[PDB]
Symmetry: D2
Subunit: 124 residues, 4 copies
């Protein structure tokens, strides 16, 4: 029931030096890269010749200039610009001068989820 | 023709602090994480409101204990174990004691390509 | 009592995108790079215009070929080579063929502490 | 003249998986972490039982809110805030409203060098 070296995961790394073989019941742990959020259990364990399932590193969201221009919005806090937001973090927008929240628009405050921000839309 | 913040790529990072806006003709550069190999041009450039296409970070290959056991092979160089190999790096195997390269088998020396190693197979 | 951007630390990174200003009572967190061990509290907090003290990323230890050759020792577990060990992890050595632990020698099992391994010594 | 595993350096990493032994004439390469600038030759080579000297990862500079407040300056470009600057990158300041560059002051444009920014000073 020994295991080989643990699997790489995107945007994360194991916290220890990889070995060529691991005894059953051995474990290793992952950490996601800085702006990535680790989803699930960080620890994998060797049992019956296989590692358990690694966690996922959930993607940050990047602000889009073109979407913001198109939707007539700007970041609310010019001194606190979350150009990259972690999964679970919120970004707050405002309508640009001379615009108002459209009907059916998402709230001006919106949450990053694995790369995706649902942007609000303002109308003149 | 200004651009917003540059896009994240898997397993790589930009080498400078991201800005909220970039003038046309501005550029930034990526670096892949250690065992990843950067494919293409590391530099992206802002033109006509869009960034050019970022490079790709090609995946390393991890040795599989179960595949090696199944194919009756071992690493040749026990003092030089490439448990993780970069894209473009080769790994050399040997047949286990009492086995020989099978017909149609890949060569004992084999090259990592973006996560995939084509393993040789030995028969008793 | 607002704070500016949080301080860089060696071999670690903050887990969120840095902002130009932070309100009092704001906090950010650090993570150390993979084989580094974070000593202390990962969180810093902004109070009275200053950040609290960041943690330290304690160094891994690298095995020395020259010291091992000089002290007539080898790693015990040739399939489980901790070429780099985390702070707090132990490395186990053996005497080479035809040698014995010297008097006053450190134990064959020894612990990495912030870059330093105290190696055992064997005599013919 | 064989070498052991290559040495860790602060804020950088080798680009290949470390091996337990290296033949003379072998080489490995370092990369610095994103906002660090690699000074010198990235490649180390094994000769006569020793690795050659690794490069240095030169530190980025972080803007100080307290120094800026004390010197009556602000960043010039509020849409292009280099909160962290690479070694060799310049940061441009302006005097705050109702102040002028002091005599003997450093230029408003100033260059980051391994963590240190020489800030300009303005007087009322």
């Amino acid at each position: 029931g020994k295991c080989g070296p643990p699997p790489p995961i995107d945007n994360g790394d194991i916290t220890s030096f990889p070995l060529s073989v691991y005894a059953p019941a051995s474990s290793v742990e992952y950490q996601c890269q800085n702006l990535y959020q680790l989803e699930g259990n960080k620890r994998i364990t060797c049992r019956n010749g296989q590692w358990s399932e690694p966690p996922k590193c959930l993607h940050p969201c990047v602000i889009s200039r073109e979407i913001m221009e198109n939707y007539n919005i700007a970041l609310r806090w010019t001194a606190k610009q979350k150009l990259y937001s972690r999964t679970g973090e919120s970004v707050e927008f405002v309508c640009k001068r001379g615009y108002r929240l459209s009907s059916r628009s998402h709230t001006l405050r919106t949450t990053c989820w694995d790369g995706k921000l649902e942007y609000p839309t303002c109308a003149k």
